Design an enzyme around this catalytic site. Structure first.
Site, mmCIF file in Angstrom:
data_model
loop_
_atom_site.group_PDB
_atom_site.id
_atom_site.type_symbol
_atom_site.label_atom_id
_atom_site.label_comp_id
_atom_site.label_asym_id
_atom_site.label_seq_id
_atom_site.Cartn_x
_atom_site.Cartn_y
_atom_site.Cartn_z
ATOM 1 N N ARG A 110 -2.114 -6.196 -8.606
ATOM 2 C CA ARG A 110 -1.038 -7.178 -8.386
ATOM 3 C C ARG A 110 -1.036 -8.319 -9.396
ATOM 4 O O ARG A 110 0.047 -8.779 -9.778
ATOM 5 C CB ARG A 110 -1.116 -7.810 -6.984
ATOM 6 C CG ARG A 110 -0.868 -6.884 -5.812
ATOM 7 C CD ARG A 110 -1.052 -7.646 -4.513
ATOM 8 N NE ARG A 110 -2.440 -8.072 -4.304
ATOM 9 C CZ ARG A 110 -3.152 -7.807 -3.212
ATOM 10 N NH1 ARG A 110 -2.615 -7.124 -2.209
ATOM 11 N NH2 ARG A 110 -4.405 -8.230 -3.112
ATOM 12 N N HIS A 167 0.843 -1.215 0.000
ATOM 13 C CA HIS A 167 0.000 0.000 0.000
ATOM 14 C C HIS A 167 0.871 1.255 0.000
ATOM 15 O O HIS A 167 0.546 2.226 -0.685
ATOM 16 C CB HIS A 167 -0.906 0.036 1.241
ATOM 17 C CG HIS A 167 -1.896 -1.084 1.306
ATOM 18 N ND1 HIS A 167 -1.992 -1.880 2.417
ATOM 19 C CD2 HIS A 167 -2.772 -1.527 0.366
ATOM 20 C CE1 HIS A 167 -2.927 -2.777 2.141
ATOM 21 N NE2 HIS A 167 -3.432 -2.597 0.915
ATOM 22 N N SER A 180 -2.944 -7.743 2.902
ATOM 23 C CA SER A 180 -3.205 -7.613 4.350
ATOM 24 C C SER A 180 -3.616 -8.981 4.951
ATOM 25 O O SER A 180 -3.119 -9.345 6.029
ATOM 26 C CB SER A 180 -4.313 -6.590 4.597
ATOM 27 O OG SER A 180 -3.833 -5.282 4.330
#
Ligand SMILES: CC1=Nc2nc(NCc3cccc(Br)c3)nn2C(=O)C1
Ligand SMILES: CC1=Nc2nc(NCc3cccc(Br)c3)nn2C(=O)C1
Ligand SMILES: CC1=Nc2nc(NCc3cccc(Br)c3)nn2C(=O)C1
Lengths: 158, 158, 160, 160, 158, 160
Positions: free
Chosen positions: E90, E17, E128
């Site tokens: 990604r 991030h 995450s």
């Protein structure tokens, strides 16, 4: 002696998992079929039940050892003296998530090599989740599971 | 008379679902829009509400019959005398899971042929989940739902 | 409804995967036209006359199949044949992105033609005429993937 | 077990991505044959003799690697070499669908040969010999992706 | 002044991030790092904790403003006077869902342009969820998180 | 910030999909260079001079667009043009894997150039210049996908 680990939730172990572990035993001297506790997934079968089912389903394979674990996978592999980590690859959806896990396991234990094996076309479209969904609706899943596992799934849902 | 079944959770039925069922009625003599109870998904609307919404949204289509079910999909299709199973395909992510379901349904009922239809570009990026997420945040979803469904979703979240 | 469907392709050569798809299509629709593209961009291994004869022999047992060659855009031929259904075979290894492009373009060209995607048996879900030809050219056994008449014709073609 | 593995490809030229995969394979299996395809369908930038010499020099430090050229179907060569393992490199940008087709076809041809997929370092997960050649041909810096001997040979090849 | 919004759950904010927001600040005059409340996701950290972690992790970036929100993303972007919506890409699995969100956000606010940025290869295989899974099993995640976030995650799981 | 962006491609011919992307880019960045590749590996249907004139006419209404031809590596041209943003159009049917390879390679070549991916309208999310040319060549209606000047030029090109 080359030692490989085949980790997973195995809730329950299917013919697809049997196919992968059989291919693994033909390649490596000793294979540890490692069942993760996986509480975040809220499994149908307890870890103790999953271990018992897998032991019975793999008893015909001489170089398979079934062990349960709650540890970080990479620490469990180091503690088993494993240098190979086996994962099955059915399709594209698996591939993406498998890359993330393998790159993380490599960061945690660089000498543990991830190796992906491809199941037979027969088991290329099944999963533990799919077999449980059919079985919850009383659909016939005898074709996809070892006999002891099929009995246990019928009994669990009875 | 060729009978097709279009099964799904339809929580709630969207313009994307209307597009698919309309294409189905232009191809087959009778189409059963079959709403699965789906308790594992924890639906927003009860089965009775989903059936009522779909009946009202499809009343203009003469050869559509809306029915709720809790059975194994394949047994419900056999019991409806259906030989075609309709599923909508929006993108790659759908495709992979759709193959697993279709191969399992073929194992359970070999004469039930799965046929995939492609929605209009207009509905190619929407889903019941996405429409509910926008509506939970009071975003305008009038464009994506039949009028009766939009009213019901506003009332449900009020 | 008396539905007419078209199942187009190069069929160079027709494989057991193609036979599986066309068989499924005949169980669903009243009349199925197996349409063989005359002039593909890549010079085919078998001529159009060879591809038609092989597909005819391999589908002779299916009463509602008609094998025909075509040289126009697949939508132009479908329109002239009064077909309202376009059969596409979706293998586990198909370019789904290409299938989406093709289907949206075919819908723009002929809105009254509906693209229908059928799934072959798991047995043929990982093959293609391309892969079969490449293997056979490189001295590999492809008997399992082809109708017997096609296997005989392919051996004769590769012997020259 | 005394396992023999084969790692086939065009290696035109061999890159750091290929070196990464073959290095991982040598840590797993007793003997690794890096097998270079003699006559690919697309005329290679480097001749078979050039590709072999470059791969030999670039893998000289790995004691259990044998570099060899082959012209038959990859399964026919694997069988003759008594290999039971087929190494495939799986990049983050690989055609996984093609890999599945290839592995199922190789299993049909030689059931005793097991396809094993290895993952390269993140560093080489987004490259290919194709992309490297295209960039180098268009006056781009590719030094980072190649063994030094390969970098020297590629500069000499592009200078002519 | 061009204003961009970078919305997300950020539970917790990772180096991936940080990479995306840094690229965003090099392109646009002002970047709003917008943390969604996301109750449906049952986050590990409260919104207040996620905001505090992100503020500390981005304090070195002069043109980043960290704000929490419970509104519809598109309404929050309009209310921040943003005309650019940043999202990180990604791999393929992200791409499909990102298209649905972007087409919905375009329907809700046509002048808000979605722009996708690609992270460094270093962070291309993390998330995450993955970092939390490793940390729940006491695996080392120091490499993937800002120092303040790593401390907070260790303390949260202690 | 006074940002300069580059939007490269073959534009053979420029379509409504390309117009959509470049229009979105002009609303975001101060100056947009629509860069047309001079010598693509595959001989283009339209010459570089034809592709430039068509793109110029089709973008004349956008004040901050500059149409230019280039023959070097796209990163070498971006560097010389002092561009810090690379515009890539991401269709629902794009090869995302290729886009990732390209962007990581472009970042290696020119780290100061940031790849930005823009999404076209749903209307153009399933087309390509390749598909449009193939359809038009095979006597299919592609008027909907092209600017009027491009439609006129394509009809003239296909008539010869
Ligand atoms: C929307 C499109 N329609 C098309 N019709 C044809 N006809 C020629 C043809 C050549 C090879 C295989 C097949 Br089957 C058909 N090509 N074509 C396109 O490439 C796109
Ligand atoms: C199942 C297949 N086996 C195959 N063996 C070969 N040998 C020739 C060859 C050419 C380029 C790279 C490589 Br590596 C091998 N080709 N081939 C196929 O295309 C499919
Ligand atoms: C990292 C790469 N940079 C590249 N620059 C160019 N320039 C020539 C070119 C030809 C066709 C379309 C476009 Br746009 C550019 N090619 N190329 C690559 O293939 C990979």
């Amino acid at each position: 002696q080359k030692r490989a680990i085949y980790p997973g939730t195995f809730d329950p172990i299917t013919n697809g998992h049997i196919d992968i572990v059989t291919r693994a035993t033909q390649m490596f001297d000793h294979v540890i079929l490692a069942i993760a506790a996986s509480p975040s997934k809220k499994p149908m079968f307890t870890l103790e039940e999953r271990v018992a089912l897998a032991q019975q389903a793999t008893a015909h394979l001489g170089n398979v050892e079934v062990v349960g674990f709650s540890d970080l996978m990479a620490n469990f592999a180091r503690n088993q003296h494993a240098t190979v980590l086996i994962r099955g690859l059915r399709a594209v959806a698996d591939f993406e998530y498998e890359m993330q896990l393998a790159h993380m396991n490599r960061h945690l234990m660089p000498e543990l090599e991830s190796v992906f094996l491809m199941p037979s076309k027969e088991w290329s479209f099944i999963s533990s989740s799919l077999v449980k969904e059919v079985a919850r609706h009383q659909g016939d899943v005898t074709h996809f599971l070892p006999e002891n596992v099929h009995q246990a799934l019928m009994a669990k849902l009875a």
